[PDB]
Design an enzyme around this catalytic site. Structure first.
Site, short mmCIF file in Angstrom:
data_model
loop_
_atom_site.label_atom_id
_atom_site.label_comp_id
_atom_site.label_asym_id
_atom_site.label_seq_id
_atom_site.Cartn_x
_atom_site.Cartn_y
_atom_site.Cartn_z
N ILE C 56 22.92 7.86 -53.01
CA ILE C 56 22.11 8.59 -53.80
C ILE C 56 22.82 9.67 -54.44
O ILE C 56 23.69 9.99 -53.82
CB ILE C 56 20.66 8.81 -53.21
CG1 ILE C 56 19.46 8.91 -53.93
CG2 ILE C 56 21.09 10.11 -52.32
CD1 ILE C 56 19.18 7.59 -54.72
N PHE C 99 19.88 17.49 -45.24
CA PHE C 99 21.13 16.71 -44.73
C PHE C 99 22.17 17.80 -43.93
O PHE C 99 22.55 18.65 -44.55
CB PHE C 99 21.99 16.00 -45.70
CG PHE C 99 21.25 14.66 -45.94
CD1 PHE C 99 20.27 14.53 -47.13
CD2 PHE C 99 21.53 13.54 -45.11
CE1 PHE C 99 19.56 13.34 -47.35
CE2 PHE C 99 20.89 12.18 -45.48
CZ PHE C 99 19.91 12.17 -46.20
#
Lengths: 384, 820, 107, 375
Positions: C56, C99
């Protein structure tokens, strides 16, 4: 209207004749050709009769005036009785042999199929509208075959039971509107206690056999149980009970129900709806053919899964239909899955609901990828 | 909370154990797209950790192991499992090295048997497919039902098999200690899930040879020695463990069979070369044998003047010592075959003490020992156990049941076979799942590669042996049976496969013949295939029998009467799908009946000549069922076919009744065209049903009766009138707009050609005057029209080419033979 | 729509530029705080070829703004993430992703 | 083509090996003989080392065969619409079928030795429920023809061979206390589906042989590809051989049970149904003779047709003898009112002119000598 018919139709309950003579004493004597004796269909409790506008029909027992409703056996068609004996009598007629010829003795005519066949019978089912003919054809000799005691016993309950609910439904829609308030009920009281007894009898009458039994014995009890359920469906008992739940469901709570029927009738409401779902679960359990009937109205049970008063039973009903009929899975759409998942969110961690989902995934060993994904998509990502 | 508390918190334990079941259910049957999605909620570390957790509750231990297998191992397991039933062997030196017995010095007939699974297997098995589960990857731009299928999520297998092997050793040593606290709670919860994992890996082929050696040592050490440590086979395990135990045994039982098959292939490789060599030298010697011989050489070279099948049969025809006269093989070669037969049956345990010494007699002892210990209460365990027992006691029979799937291929095209096999994996995987739009595209490309594979044509016997045509058929059977009453969704793949099957029929007669043997099975499913165009099961049925004089003769009565009964239904009822689409109603189906007629047209006419048996049978069913003829030529009150045609022409010409009144669907139905097309095929059917002229000239008894019957049904004035009907003509004008008719919605030459074929085969041409009376009004407008239309502006049009085929196929062949 | 927080300083000089595959161990996070993905669980490094749009765009841009040995906390807004459709069967639509990426090595 | 085809040594290796194996199995594997049925049962018929525990119950606890038979009865009793196929059932049922028979003037004293051992083997099977097992499988087949039911009867004959009285008694007792209907319903359906001689198929086959085709993978000379005339003949042979055996020994108890079923709700008359089948047979064989006036000689297919076709009539006639001897008056009356007489007439007229036709030549001495023992 009586019809000849061939195939699997007349192994059902709609083909059972009871031979009722005119003598109260010694009615179980043997049969004499050419002696008066009525014909009665067990499920309807009606009698064969020569009517005036529709020829040969069945009439209610209220108007079985012994003239149009009498018949006589014979071995031939030639014009010719003996006096009744208060004993067993002499053995005449065979089972599986000894072709008989019934004659409406009062009118002298003979029952025979109507020869013409319209466009409806040009290619469709071959049912012959038998008519009481003045002379009749040649090949209308008849066999006599014995049904087993069990289904003969079974048949009479359908006739007894159905009229009970016919009265019950008539009571239900009688007070469907018209709130009682604080006054008297709508009309005549409903046979609630008799219905309660009836349901309790049927549920036991449909209890699946216990696993502790020997194998072959269990299989035999399935043979009977399968035959019973199909007979009741073929007599429309499932249509009856579905009408029962439909009429009962218009009340959300017992006090709301009591506002239209009565306080004394309010207590039984949760009991009867629990019995109804239990009976339905017994009715559908194990039969693919009976099971398949919910494909047309799958949304109906889903519309009732949100109800609280009888939810364990209806969830068991849904478990039984999904565990058996694959095509119902092929009818499943996203709104359904949103309803079951809402049940899990509303009714706690009821492990049964998981088994419902597991039945949704695979049925009889075929994967349903159109459903499996919807289960994952609407359940797994949230993680709550 | 600690998961080990669930051994106490039962009320949640059941729920979570069900939860794992639901995870298996959603990922069940190779839904790998879901199977990747599961890897978020359960992680590889969690699974590997949960494997060794001794204190973990029983049901959750088995649930987690099964959940592992389902998420990672089933799809490749099941595909490999199906591919285990086939045995494709390459012509390679590694195949050559394969021998029935390992080299040794034990005995002349049979040395010590090779250890099961230990050795080399050259049989074709496609590569496994795996994907690394990584979820941060960008969403592929390919939409739904178009992206290629996700592979099985990956997991370290060489480390997994080491962990599993160590786990097994732990269980084996633990079991002998007779401890009161088995891992997980119960002995069955201890041994069973682990044994399931070992079995799955064994099917997977992950284990190397030394790994297999250890597996054989843990199950039974002393029997499987090559030259408390007590094995599984005597710890009096519960019945449920015995089920997995049998699974383990039968896996090895397949290995010797596959070994035998390959060893036979290796023998075939070495032996056949000697056969061809000796037969070559005998040929060269026989060509110069004339110097000392005579016409007895005709007997000698009969072998060389006979096809190879009987050549090799007579080459092998020396087994019983009473048939060696026709065998030309020298005795050394003759000995070699018998030698290979001797040790082969010895490896089958046929011909040749408390030490079992070998797999077959060991397991036979095992099975009998289990049976006599107690009444086994698991029906599946009983069925499997006796399944094995039969397999051991009949070594030769199972081999004979395995050879029909054995095929030898040259090493050149192995990758081509691999390409084919992966598609075979797709189709085989689609038996057990309801069809969806993604799968539809999978099948379409799956067969797309098959048609592009040359081996699919180069070795057609192999394709039949795999039965891929059967596998496709089951798929359509499920597609048709699902919603057969209403209409068939996903028709694109249906007609793609029906195109494929017709291709498969054209490959060879035998392929067609085997495809044919399921003809009756097609017919009931074809009862609703009329709705979709393109290719149908009926089309497959037609191509299943086309131009096969043996087959049209063998075409059974029941099949024919079943078809005409369907045609009766089409001729008696409308088309509900067309009725729903706005079309007006008529009391019959021109399209559906026309499709049946086209089938019958191929059913009775073979290679340019009629078949009397089929011809007389079909007309006998048409006459007994006069409703087949339709509203015209029906009997009582039925108007003539002549009268029937004109309004059908008007219906097609005048809109708002030809179609719905709402091509646009690219196959928009035109009622008048369909009605006349049905009539045309009806006439063409009867015309091809007409008896041959040598029969009519011989005046065969019943043969004259049929021609009499057809002449009674069809009158001449109808034949000449419709043959003489006008045709729409292309013209130039209106700013040069070449006004061309729509062949789907206009009168066509083909329908006239059908009646010309009728007249020729039924009435024929006898007198000159009637010939000219047909020529002037029926044929002469056609020739003058075609000759006028023979211009560069119009000769390439559809109508012009229609006439070119019409004249050169119907009119001109008729005129040429009646020229005198 | 991505913002980065330093966690464990590395070099800060050899930024990842086009040409070399990035080898990283990461650890996904739902915004509400539910762990769903990592790389140490699978024990193997996740190596992705930059510039080819395999991952992404939010993660790609975050990885670009990182440096060798610099553990960083990423934050992919739904626009630079899976967005209105979501990763089926894992991540619902319209959720921000966090993340714990640790770029251990460039090759 | 045989003058100008490819010589065998010029064929590719993989193709050559492919035809090599399929020839080899037909030459050595299929031809191979290996009897193991006796050692099968002799292994599974023993109670190996259970005397040590010595439980109180007499019940002979271990029995591998009995469990196998019980298991087959278990799957036979399921509530299943269609009866599937089981390859193990093929294997085991065939094995136990083959295990019983195991078979220049030789005397009586040693004849009885072989029969008494044949009974012993039959006892070794029927005492473990195999007798009932066959019965349920016949009930379960629902009158659907097949290989598994064909093996089932093959077993039934294997245990009924020699006219085992007590086996017949066990058969009768099982029906009597079960009062099953479908067993005779299936028997009736199976016999109704049995084929008869047909003209159309025969002439179609004659034309097919007239073509004399070849395939593409070489050529086979006069292949015996699928036969559409009397394909199921051995099924009809052994069906009546089964009925004859179950009425052997003049079992008046059983014959009357066949003519009428006392216990059962619906009675099915086997005798009249058997006659009706004979009537269909009579028309078939008759019409086949009604195809042979213009043709004054009988070829091979016509002879081989009559050879197998008449063995049906021979078996049926032996069956009717077993239904009638003893004698069973009720059966005798049933045949008196049957269509047997008209069938007898048709057979007589066929035998009448047929044996003239066969007497015109010595080419059909064989078929004539069978016809003689037929009437």
């Amino acid at each position: 209207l009586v019809y000849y018919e061939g195939g699997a139709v007349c192994t059902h309950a709609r083909s059972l004749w009871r031979l009722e003579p005119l003598r109260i004493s010694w009615s179980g004597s043997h049969l004499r050709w050419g002696q008066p004796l009525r014909i009665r269909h067990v499920t309807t409790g009606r009698y064969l009769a020569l009517t005036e506008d529709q020829g040969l029909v069945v009439v209610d027992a209220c108007k079985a005036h012994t003239k149009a409703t009498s018949f006589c056996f014979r071995v031939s068609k030639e014009k010719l009785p003996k006096r009744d004996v208060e004993g067993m009598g002499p053995p005449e007629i065979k089972y599986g042999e000894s072709l008989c010829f019934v004659q409406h003795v009062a009118s002298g005519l003979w029952l025979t199929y109507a020869a013409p066949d319209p466009k409806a019978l040009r290619l469709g089912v071959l049912k012959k509208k038998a008519i009481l003919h003045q002379e009749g054809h040649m090949d209308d000799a008849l066999f006599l075959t014995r049904c087993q005691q069990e289904e003969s016993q079974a048949a009479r309950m359908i006739h007894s039971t159905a009229g009970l609910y016919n009265q019950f439904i008539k009571g239900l829609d009688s007070f469907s509107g018209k709130p009682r308030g604080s006054g008297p009920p709508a009309g005549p009281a409903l046979p609630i206690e008799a219905v309660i007894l009836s349901l309790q009898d049927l549920i036991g009458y449909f209890e699946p056999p216990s696993e502790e039994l020997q194998h072959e014995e269990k299989q035999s009890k399935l043979r009977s149980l399968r035959n019973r359920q199909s007979l009741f469906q073929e007599e429309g008992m499932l249509s009856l009970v579905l009408n029962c739940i439909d009429r009962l469901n218009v009340y959300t709570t017992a006090a709301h129900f009591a506002e239209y029927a009565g306080e004394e009738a309010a207590e039984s409401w949760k009991e009867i709806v629990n019995l109804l779902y239990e009976l339905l679960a017994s009715l559908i359990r194990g039969n693919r053919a009976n099971c398949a009937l919910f494909s047309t109205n799958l949304d109906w049970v889903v519309s009732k899964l949100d109800r609280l008063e009888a939810s364990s039973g209806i969830l068991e009903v849904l478990y039984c239909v999904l565990i058996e009929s694959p095509e119902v899975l092929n009818i499943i759409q996203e709104n359904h899955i949103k309803s079951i998942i809402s049940l899990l969110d509303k009714h706690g961690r009821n492990h049964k609901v998981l088994d419902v989902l597991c039945s949704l995934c695979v049925c009889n060993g075929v994967a349903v990828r159109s459903n499996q994904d919807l289960i994952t998509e609407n359940l797994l990502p949230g993680r709550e | 909370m600690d998961i080990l508390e669930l051994s106490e918190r039962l009320d949640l334990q059941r729920f979570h154990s069900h939860t794992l079941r639901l995870y298996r259910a959603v990922c069940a049957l190779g839904n790998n797209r879901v199977a990747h999605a599961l890897c978020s909620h359960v992680d590889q570390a969690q699974l590997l950790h949960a494997l060794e957790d001794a204190h973990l509750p029983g049901p959750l231990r088995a649930g987690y192991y099964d959940l592992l297998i389902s998420i990672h191992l089933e799809s490749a397991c099941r595909s490999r499992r199906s591919m285990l039933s086939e045995y494709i062997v390459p012509l390679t030196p590694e195949t050559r090295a394969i021998t029935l017995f390992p080299p040794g010095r034990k005995g002349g007939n049979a040395r010590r048997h090779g250890l099961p699974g230990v050795g080399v297997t050259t049989s074709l098995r496609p590569p496994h497919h795996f994907s690394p589960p990584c979820f941060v990857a960008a969403l592929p731009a390919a939409g739904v039902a178009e992206a290629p299928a996700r592979l099985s999520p990956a997991i370290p297998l060489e480390a997994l098999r080491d962990k599993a092997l160590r786990m097994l050793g732990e269980a084996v040593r633990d079991g002998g200690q007779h401890a009161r606290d088995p891992v997980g709670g119960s002995v069955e919860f201890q041994f069973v899930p682990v044994l399931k994992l070992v079995s799955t890996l064994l099917v997977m082929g992950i284990f190397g040879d030394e790994d297999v050696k250890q597996i054989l040592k843990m199950i039974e050490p002393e029997v499987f020695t090559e030259e408390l440590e007590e094995g599984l086979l005597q710890m009096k395990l519960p019945e449920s463990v015995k089920l997995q135990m049998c699974n383990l045994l039968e896996y090895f039982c397949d290995q010797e069979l596959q070994h035998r098959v390959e060893s036979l292939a290796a023998f075939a490789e070495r032996y056949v070369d000697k056969l061809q060599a000796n037969q070559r030298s005998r040929y060269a010697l026989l060509m110069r044998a004339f110097t000392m011989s005579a016409a007895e050489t005709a007997r000698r070279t009969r072998e060389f003047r006979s096809p190879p099948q009987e050549q090799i049969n007579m080459l092998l025809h020396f087994k019983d010592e009473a048939d060696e006269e026709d065998c030309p093989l020298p005795e050394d070669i003759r000995q070699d075959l018998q030698d290979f037969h001797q040790d082969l049956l010895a490896h089958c345990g046929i011909q040749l003490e408390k030490k079992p010494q070998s797999l077959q007699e060991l397991v036979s002892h095992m099975v009998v020992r289990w049976a006599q210990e107690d009444y086994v209460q698991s029906p599946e365990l009983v069925r499997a156990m006796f399944s094995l027992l039969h397999r051991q006691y009949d070594g030769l029979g199972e081999l004979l049941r395995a050879l029909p799937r054995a095929y030898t291929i040259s090493p050149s095209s192995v990758e081509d076979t691999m390409s084919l096999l992966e598609c075979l994996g797709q189709i085989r995987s689609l038996l057990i799942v309801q069809m969806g739009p993604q799968e539809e595209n999978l099948m379409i490309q799956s067969i797309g590669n098959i048609m592009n594979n040359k081996v699919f044509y180069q070795h057609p016997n192999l394709m039949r042996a795999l039965g891929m045509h059967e596998t496709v058929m089951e798929v359509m059977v499920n597609v048709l049976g699902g919603g057969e009453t209403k209409e068939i969704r996903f028709p694109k793949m249906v007609t793609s496969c029906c195109r494929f099957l017709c291709y498969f029929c054209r490959i060879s007669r035998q392929n067609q013949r085997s495809m044919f043997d399921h003809l009756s099975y097609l017919l009931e499913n074809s009862g609703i295939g009329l709705g979709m165009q393109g290719s149908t099961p009926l089309d497959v049925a037609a191509a299943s029998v086309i131009d096969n004089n043996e087959l049209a003769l063998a075409l059974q009565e029941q099949d024919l009467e079943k078809v005409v009964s369907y045609l009766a239904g089409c001729g008696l009822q409308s088309c509900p799908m067309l009725l729903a689409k706005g079309y007006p109603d008529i009391g019959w189906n021109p399209c559906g009946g026309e499709r049946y007629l086209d089938f019958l047209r191929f059913a009775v006419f073979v290679n340019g000549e009629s078949v009397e048996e089929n011809a007389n049978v079909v007309v006998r069913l048409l006459i007994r069922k006069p409703e087949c003829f339709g509203p015209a030529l029906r009997g009582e009150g039925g108007s003539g076919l002549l009268a029937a045609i004109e309004e059908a022409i008007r219906i097609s010409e005048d809109p708002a009744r030809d179609g719905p009144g709402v091509p646009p669907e690219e196959n928009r139905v035109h009622l008048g065209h369909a009605i006349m097309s049905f009539y045309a095929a009806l006439i063409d059917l009867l015309g091809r049903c007409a008896p041959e002229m040598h029969l009519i000239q011989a005046g065969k008894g019943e043969a004259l009766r049929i021609r009499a019957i057809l002449r009674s049904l069809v009158p001449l004035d109808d034949l000449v009138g419709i043959i003489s009907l006008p045709l729409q003509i292309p013209t130039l004008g209106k700013d040069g707009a070449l006004v061309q008719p729509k062949m789907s919605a206009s009168f066509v030459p083909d329908h006239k050609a059908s009646m010309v074929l009728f007249l020729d085969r039924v009435y024929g041409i006898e007198n000159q005057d009637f010939l000219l009376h047909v020529l002037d009004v029926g044929f002469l407008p056609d020739m003058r029209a075609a000759a006028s239309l023979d211009t560069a502006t119009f000769s390439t049009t559809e109508m012009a080419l229609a006439l070119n085929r019409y004249l050169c196929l119907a009119v001109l062949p008729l005129i040429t033979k009646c020229a005198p | 729509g991505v913002e980065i927080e330093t966690i464990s300083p590395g070099d800060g000089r050899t930024f990842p530029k086009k040409g070399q595959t990035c080898v990283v161990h990461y650890t996904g996070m739902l915004q509400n705080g539910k762990k769903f993905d990592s790389s140490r669980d699978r024990n193997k490094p996740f190596k992705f070829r930059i510039g080819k749009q395999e991952v992404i765009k939010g993660f790609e841009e975050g990885a670009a703004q990182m440096s060798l040995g610099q553990r960083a906390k990423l934050t992919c807004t739904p626009d630079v993430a899976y967005g209105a459709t979501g990763h089926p069967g894992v991540i619902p639509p319209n959720a921000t992703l966090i993340f714990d990426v640790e770029l251990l090595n460039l090759e | 083509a045989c003058f100008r085809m490819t010589p065998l040594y010029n064929l590719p290796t993989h193709r050559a090996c492919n035809m090599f194996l399929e020839s080899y199995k037909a030459a050595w594997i299929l031809t191979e003989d290996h009897s193991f049925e006796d050692r099968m049962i002799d292994d599974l018929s023993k109670a190996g080392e259970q005397e040590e525990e010595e439980e109180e119950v007499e019940e002979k606890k271990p029995d591998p065969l009995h469990q196998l038979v019980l298991h087959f009865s278990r799957t036979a009793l399921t509530e299943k619409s269609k009866l599937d196929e089981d390859y193990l059932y093929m294997a085991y049922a065939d094995i136990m079928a083959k295990s019983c028979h195991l078979e220049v003037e030789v005397s009586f004293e040693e004849k009885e030795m072989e029969k008494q051992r044949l009974l012993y083997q039959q006892s070794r099977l029927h005492t473990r429920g195999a007798a009932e097992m066959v019965l349920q499988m016949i009930s379960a087949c629902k009158g659907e023809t097949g290989a598994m039911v064909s093996s089932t009867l093959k077993l039934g004959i294997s245990i009924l061979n020699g006219g085992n009285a007590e086996v017949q008694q066990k058969m009768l007792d099982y029906l009597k206390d079960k009062k099953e209907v479908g067993f005779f319903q299936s028997i009736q359906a199976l016999m109704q589906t049995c084929s008869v001689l047909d003209l159309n198929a025969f002439e179609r086959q004659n034309k097919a042989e007239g073509l004399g085709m070849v395939n593409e993978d070489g050529t086979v000379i006069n292949r015996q590809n699928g036969e559409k005339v009397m394909a199921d003949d051995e099924f009809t042979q052994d069906l009546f051989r089964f009925l004859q055996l179950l009425c052997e020994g003049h079992n008046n108890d059983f014959q009357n049970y066949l003519r009428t079923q006392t216990g059962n709700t619906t009675t099915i008359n086997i005798i009249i149904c058997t006659v009706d089948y004979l009537l269909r047979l009579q028309e078939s064989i008759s019409d086949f003779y009604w195809y042979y006036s213009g043709k004054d000689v009988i070829e091979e297919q016509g002879k081989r047709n009559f050879s197998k076709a008449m063995s049906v009539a021979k078996q049926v006639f032996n069956s009717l003898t077993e239904y009638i001897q003893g004698p069973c008056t009720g059966n005798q009356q049933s045949l008196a009112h049957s269509r047997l007489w008209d069938a007898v007439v048709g057979f007589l007229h066929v035998f009448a002119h047929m044996m003239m036709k066969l007497a015109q030549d010595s080419s059909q001495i064989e078929l004539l000598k069978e016809l003689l023992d037929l009437q």
